[PDB]
Structures are given as C-alpha cells and as structure tokens.
C-alpha cells in the first residue's frame, strides 16, 4: 500500500472533521461525491453547473450541501469548499472496473486528474477513495473494532503459548539440555505472533483515533518480543551472528519467508533435511539473552563475555574473579552476571 | 385588497419561473422560506449563517437549494439568489397569528422589514406570502379552476334567465305594456349576475396564465350586460337620468346595495312600499336602449331624440321627416331609427 495513498487515507480517518461529515452522510443515507483539488480554475473543464461557494470548510456545511444532487469540490487540505451541486464529467473512455454511475465517475476522474475523489453510495455504508490508479475502501468503525478485537484475542492465545514455550526453554537452557527443536519451536511461535501484528496493522491505521486502545493493547502484548527473538537467534545460530544480521532474520520470517521448522533451522545455519532430525541436534546458548535482559549487560560488552567463555554454561560456572578478566566487566557487572545467573538456576531448576 | 399587495402576488402567480419552482417544491414536500430583498447588506442583522451565492436565479437552482434547511434570499426582481441555507432572525417579540416556526418567522420578518417573505410548509400544499402586515394565501391551480368552473356554470344559468327576462321585456316594451315589476325583475337578475363576476374576479387573478380561458368565458358571457343595464336605467327611471348617473346606479347595486325589488324601484325614483305594488305601476321606455343598441345612434344624439319625443312609443310613431327635425339626425339616422323599430315590431310582436 503506497505511502502517498496512506496519507490520503488519513484525510478520512476516524477523528477528522471530514470523516465526521462522511459518517453523518452515510447515516442519513444521502450519497456523496467529493473532488479534492488545490486550484479550482484548472478543472473548469471537468466541472459543470453547480454553485461557486469558495467558503471555509466545516463538517456541518459539507453535510448540508450533500443534501443536494451532484458533487462537492473541496481544497486538498480540506480547508475550503469551492463548489457544491456540480456535475463531474471526466472522459467516458477511461477504463473503469466500477458499476455505479458515481463510482465510475469517481474512478475515471481520479485517473484522469491524479486527484482524490471520494464516493459514498446511498445504499451501502463504505467510503470508497480513489486516487490516481488506486482505490481504497474505508470500513465503518464497528466493523474494524470487531476484526481488531478478534485479532487481539487471537494474539493473547499465541502469546500465552509463546510464554509457555519460553519458560520451558529457560529450564532447558539453564540445564544445558537444549535441542534444535526446542529453539525452532520457540522461534516459530514468536514469528507467527509478530505476523499477526503485521496483518492487523492496516485495520489499526484505518481506525484512526478510534484505535488508541487497540494500539496500547498490541504494545503491551508484544513489547519485548522482537528483541527476545533476535537474542535467541544470536544465541543459537550455528555460527556467530551480529545483532543487525539477526534483526534481519527476524524481519525475513515476519514477512517474506514462511516460518517452517526446517526452514528456520536452515536459516540458522543447520544443514537439516527432516523435521524429525531436530530433536537429535544439541545446542548451547551463547549467553546473550541472559546477559542483556537479565544481567543488563550491553551487547557490546556481551560479545566480550561470550568471546571468552563461549557459552552460558561456562559463564554460569565462572567466578567474579574470572568474569572480571573480561574487558568491560568491573566488580559491578561481574557481580550482576554471576548473581543473576545463580539466582535463576536456584529458582527455575 | 391593496394594489400594493397585488403587485407582489404577481411574483408567485402561475406562469412565473418562481411559481414553477414553488410548485416543484410543494410536490417534493421539501420546505421553503424565501426572503426578497433589494440590498442584502442592510439586512445582515436578520440574516445568519448560510452560504453567500450571489448567482443568477433559475427555478432549478431554487428547487435544489431548497433541499437544505433554513432560508433562501433572493433579489426583489427575482433575478438573483444571494443566500441559501441561512437562519432568518426577526425580533421574536413581534406579534404573530401564525403557528409553527416557519410561518411565525416569515410574518415577523415581513412586518419588521416591510419586505416580502414567502413560506411553504411540508404538511400542506399552499403558498403563504407575507408583505408588511399583510398575508396572502396562494391556492393551487386545481382548486382555483374547480371554483371558477362552478362560478362559470352558475353564471350561464343566470345569463340564461336574464336573456329570458330581457326577451319578454322586449315584447312588452314594443307593445308599450311594461310595468315596474318587469323592469326591476330584469335589473335584479342583471345586477346579481355581475355581482358573481366581481366575486370570482380575485380567483381569476390568482390563476395567472392558467386563467386565460376563464377570462375569455367571463367576457363572452357578460359582454354587453353592463351597457344594457345602464340603458335600462336611463329608460325606466322615474325621471330623466344621465348615463353617468345610470352607471353609478349600476356600480352601487353591484357592490354596495342589495338588489332587492323594492330597493331597485326606490333608487329608480319610484316611491313604493310592498313588492305587490310593482305589478300596478305602468312605465314607458324613453328609447335609449333601442336607439343606441339597435338604431346605432350615439347616446349624445339620442339625448336629443328623447328630449323631443320623450318615449319609445312616440319615436315609433314618428316619420322619417319628423325625426330629422332632431339635431344630429340625418336621413340615414332617421331611416335607421324608423326601419329598425318597425322591423322589430313586425317580428317580435
């Protein structure tokens, strides 16, 4: 969905004065055909009859004017109402995939002029926006809320399982009994969870001001999910991998590529063929996740710790004295790493 | 009905584009409140909100504009539409006998500004015009034509009985056997007939262009009735009377006085009490009716003929030579008088 169009959609999103007017128009079952231009004098050829108003915009004014037949012409920034009750006459030879007279007119005018044309039928209750060669159907708030409420409820489900898999992996990680299947199963759930967020994003945008609460909910549910997945990738990829590269792996499975067991393992650097092989492949976390999220060690210093101890298993056996031998680790950080890991081991295993 | 108001009523009479728009508005059940002003500027205090149009007037424009709430402001010459969708705010303390905001507003504004204000409500099919302290309800053409067609039928019946009375009176006059009762009876019918015309007149005017046929019919039915009645007055009044006076008698009995037998015989100069006496008073026509209508002698000259011979009885005995002794009576007039009267006697008596 082109960005140029996304901006135009904002013009009619819940919260704007124009959308308030369109909502009342729909409710009154009046139709509507709105043409948005900047310089009215240049379109006199496609604008016939009607009344020249050239007055300041207002939701009530638009609504009242919509009682008359014909189209309304507004300024692109929605600050002025130039015409009302006019006949829009774009070239009738321009191809169109619409059925209604006003929608055929709308599409053709949008294509012919490259400007925004809004069409609202008397019968249905959807706002059809046309811009250049694009067409975007804007849905009613109640329809959007219903879809978004279901999606969020679906996300809670996915998140719940994600948390379960993660607490399981934690135990195994602390006991150094992880297999590639444990890692993949965890990453897959997290990938699917974030895809849900991606697919739902357009409805959220479409909700405008009516999507505040929905945004807050998605935020609480997915807060540190992405960082956590990037860290698992850094901890279990077959070869040392940078953060930026891990952030790119995440991005790939959240959109482009499908998160299947064999595929994730493959991308992680494991020449695997059968999904069943995963349970046989043993792996040990590098230690980044625990160091950053629990010990609060910046990845930069993290790399140093890993470079010396190799795995979380070794790191967990090191002493403060040992940990201090690492660059970037003073008495404070060594004590944090050591104590936080020891604390987790005693409580989780 | 002040002529001043009549001029305003023409603005919304059948035929005008304004009435054309008002009828369409009535059929659509939209409402209408129209304010006619010369210069909008000096009325901005009573004009709130709405839209400034300052465009050329047309019935289609008025009809479309009326789909919105509020009032429309036009130029007094109905050539310009200045405002649409405005709130008219006359002084609320101005007295009004109207019901419902639309008509109360119209009456008060008309009273306040001395200008014309037209109101059309949804729950009825009539136009109310307010001018100063006047109110004129304009009826639909169908209603008007119904009343006018009945009035014409009623007129045909009166005319027929009038023709029968005048016909019998003619026999009596030629035989010099007329009684006051025959004259009054004929006058009364004539007076009553012209009274109907006066009463239906305001309906014909209200019909505008659609009252053309009605006017033509009234003209064919009452053609020479007024002239005929005047001549009857000049011929049977107790003592000589000039035409102009006969006319005052006519006008008087058409509007002021009631055409009762006794009342007519009294104004004619006869002192009677009971209608029973009329059959006993013998009278003789002076001959004006016959002289002017049949012999085609100008009244101015008939005066001389009557002043010399006195009655139709004497004129009918006169010879061509005897008649020429009259000032203004030549060979032609003399022959015309003598021959037309002799012809009538041979045919009607």
What key phrases describe this protein's structure?
part of a larger assembly, 2 chains, 349 residues, alpha+beta, YojJ-like (1, Ferritin, DNA polymerase, domain 1, 8 strands, 54% helix, nucleotide-binding (chains A, B), DisA (chains A, B), DNA-binding (chains A, B), DNA damage (chains A, B), DNA binding (chains A, B)
Q: Could you please describe the fold and organization of this structure?
A:
This is part of a larger assembly, with two copies of chain A (349 residues). Chain A is α+β, with helices and mostly antiparallel strands and 349 residues long. Chain A folds into three domains: 138 residues, 3-Layer(aba) Sandwich (YojJ-like (1); 148 residues, Ferritin (Up-down Bundle); 63 residues, 5' to 3' exonuclease, C-terminal subdomain (DNA polymerase, domain 1, Orthogonal Bundle), CATH 1.10.150. Helix content of chain A is 54%, strand content 12%. Chain A contains 15 helices and eight strands. In chain A, strands 1, 2, 3, 4, 5, 6, 7 and 8 form an eight-stranded mixed beta sheet that branches. In chain A, strand 7 and strand 8 form a beta hairpin. In chain A, helix 5 runs parallel beside helix 7 and helix 6 packs antiparallel against helix 7. The longest helix of chain A has 34 residues. The first copy, chain A, is elongated and about 85 Å long. Chains A and B meet through strand 3 and helix 3 of A and strand 3 and helix 3 of B. Chains A, B: InterPro entries: DisA, DisA_sf, DNA_integrity_DisA_N_sf, DNA_integrity_scan_DisA_link, DNA_integrity_scan_DisA_N, DNA_integrity_scanning_protein, HhH_motif, RuvA_2-like. Chains A, B: It is an enzyme of class 2 (transferase). Chains A, B: Pfam families: DAC, DisA-linker, HHH.
């Amino acid at each position: 969905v082109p960005q140029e169009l996304i901006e135009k959609i904002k013009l009619i999103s819940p919260g704007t004065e124009l959308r308030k007017a369109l909502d009342d128009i729909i409710n009154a079952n009046f139709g509507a055909l709105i043409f948005l231009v900047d310089d009215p004098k240049k379109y006199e050829d496609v604008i016939q009859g009607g009344f020249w108003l050239d007055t300041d915009f207002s939701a009530e004014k638009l609504y009242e004017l919509s009682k008359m037949d014909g189209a309304i012409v507004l300024s692109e920034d929605i600050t002025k109402i130039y015409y009302a009750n006019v006949h829009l006459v774009p070239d009738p030879t321009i191809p169109t995939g619409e059925t209604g007279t006003r929608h055929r007119t709308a599409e053709r005018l949008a294509k012919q002029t490259g400007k925004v044309v809004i069409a609202v039928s008397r019968r249905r209750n959807i706002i059809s926006l046309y811009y250049k060669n694009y067409k975007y159907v804007v849905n009613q708030v109640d329809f959007l809320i219903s879809k978004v409420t279901q999606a969020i409820s679906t996300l809670e489900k996915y998140k719940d399982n994600f948390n379960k898999l993660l607490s399981e992996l934690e135990v195994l990680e602390l006991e150094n009994r992880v297999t590639l299947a444990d890692v993949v199963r965890t990453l897959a759930k997290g990938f699917e969870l974030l895809r849900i967020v991606e697919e739902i994003r357009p409805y959220i945008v479409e909700l405008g001001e009516e999507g505040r609460l929905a945004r807050m909910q998605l935020r609480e549910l997915t807060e540190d999910v992405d960082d956590l997945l990037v860290l698992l990738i850094m901890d279990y990829s077959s070869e040392e991998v940078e953060e930026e590269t891990a952030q790119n792996i995440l991005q790939d499975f959240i959109t482009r590529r499908e998160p299947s067991p064999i595929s994730i393992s493959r991308v992680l650097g494991y020449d695997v063929q059968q999904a069943a092989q995963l349970d046989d492949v043993l792996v040990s976390a590098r230690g980044y996740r625990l160091l950053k999220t629990v010990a609060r060690i910046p990845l930069s210093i993290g790399y140093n710790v890993v470079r010396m101890f190799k795995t979380l298993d070794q790191i967990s056996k090191a002493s403060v004295e040992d940990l201090k031998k690492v660059e970037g680790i003073g008495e404070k950080r060594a004590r944090a790493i050591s104590e936080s890991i020891s604390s987790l081991k005693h409580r989780k295993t």
